[PDB]
Amino acid sequence: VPDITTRKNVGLSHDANDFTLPQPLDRYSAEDHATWATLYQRQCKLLPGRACDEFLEGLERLEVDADRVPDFNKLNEKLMAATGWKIVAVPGLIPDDVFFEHLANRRFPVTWWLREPHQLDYLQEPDVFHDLFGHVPLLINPVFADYLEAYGKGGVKAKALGALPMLARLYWYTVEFGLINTPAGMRIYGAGILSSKSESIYCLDSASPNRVGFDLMRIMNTRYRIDTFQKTYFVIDSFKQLFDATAPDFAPLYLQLADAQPWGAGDIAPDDLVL
């Protein structure tokens, strides 16, 4: 049983070093554009009062197509002038070192293909709607864009054994599933939540999960689960705080956490500050 990444990339090559390729525009059907249109309108009706304001405005400022899979090159004209970043198409999942290298150079990899109609909510493997709709708009906030860039640079430098899981955890709990407390109430900045119907509602509506204040060392030592609703969400007060977190060189931090047993995705640590 071949995964969608394989079926979608048949007859398509990718750079051996950075896994990029020109966006294969001819490969989007009429149905894919309708699938995109459906995803897009469904999220936009859920996000008011949910997504943080920066996300909403980035969507507006970049003019992410509402009715068809965006043309990466066109979007880049705006994204580059506004933030200094560009998106590059990748075939699907790429190696971490290649991913860190892109972020370090203000390139955001985006899986080019779209989920098939039979699918629809945060399926196995991220796709263009998740990657583009969920990740790209926030780059409109210069501090969050600076955070991503610093995160990639730290990744390029990481050597210590155990560092990769720690950085995967940090990325997951901020970039993919992060929440942000605002004067108007708790909001969302995580891509894995913003491109998902179910997660968008759950992360702000459920009594079950823990909602914990951002804490760097705690996060890097916290497991996460892939196919279920998150059991813990980490909350930042501002993007600056997120950026400031990348200020220290992480080298000694990996060594400190290296032998620690990690927290379960559902645990509450002694030093947590919980909602």
Provide the angle, in degrees to the nearest 10, between the axes of the packed helices 163-171 and 142-157. 170
Q: Based on CB atoms, which residue is closest to Fe ion, 140 or 191?
A: 191
Give ∠ CA 88-188-136 in degrees, rounded to 5.
15
Binding site for Fe ion (CB under 5 A): 126, 191
Q: In angstroms, rounded to a whole number, what is the distance separating the alpha carbons of residues 109 and 90?
A: 6
Let me know: does 162 contact 258? Beta carbons within 8 Å.
Answer: yes
The verdict on whether residue 135 carries a ligand-binding annotation is yes
The verdict on whether residue 14 carries a ligand-binding annotation is no
Let me know: does 58 contact 136? Beta carbons within 8 Å.
Answer: yes
Q: Based on CB atoms, which residue is closest to Fe ion, 69 or 191?
A: 191
Tell me how far, at minimum, the Cβ of 135 lies from Fe ion, in Å. 6
N-terminal to C-terminal alpha carbon distance within the chain: 43
Q: Based on CB atoms, which residue is closest to Fe ion, 154 or 190?
A: 190
Tell me how far, at minimum, the Cβ of 237 lies from Fe ion, in Å. 23
Residue matched to tokens 């294969």: 24
Tell me how far, at minimum, the Cβ of 38 lies from Fe ion, in Å. 20
The verdict on whether residue 130 carries a ligand-binding annotation is yes
- Which residue, 94, 113, 117, is CA-closest to 7? 113
Tell me how far, at minimum, the Cβ of 190 lies from Fe ion, in Å. 9
Q: Based on CB atoms, which residue is closest to Fe ion, 109 or 154?
A: 109
Q: Based on CB atoms, which residue is closest to Fe ion, 148 or 163?
A: 148
Q: In angstroms, rounded to a whole number, what is the distance separating the alpha carbons of residues 176 and 97?
A: 18
Tell me how far, at minimum, the Cβ of 45 lies from Fe ion, in Å. 22
Six-digit token string for 139: 């780059």
Q: Based on CB atoms, which residue is closest to Fe ion, 163 or 191?
A: 191
Tell me how far, at minimum, the Cβ of 35 lies from Fe ion, in Å. 18
Binding residues: 130, 135, 176
Binding residues for Fe cation: 130, 135, 176
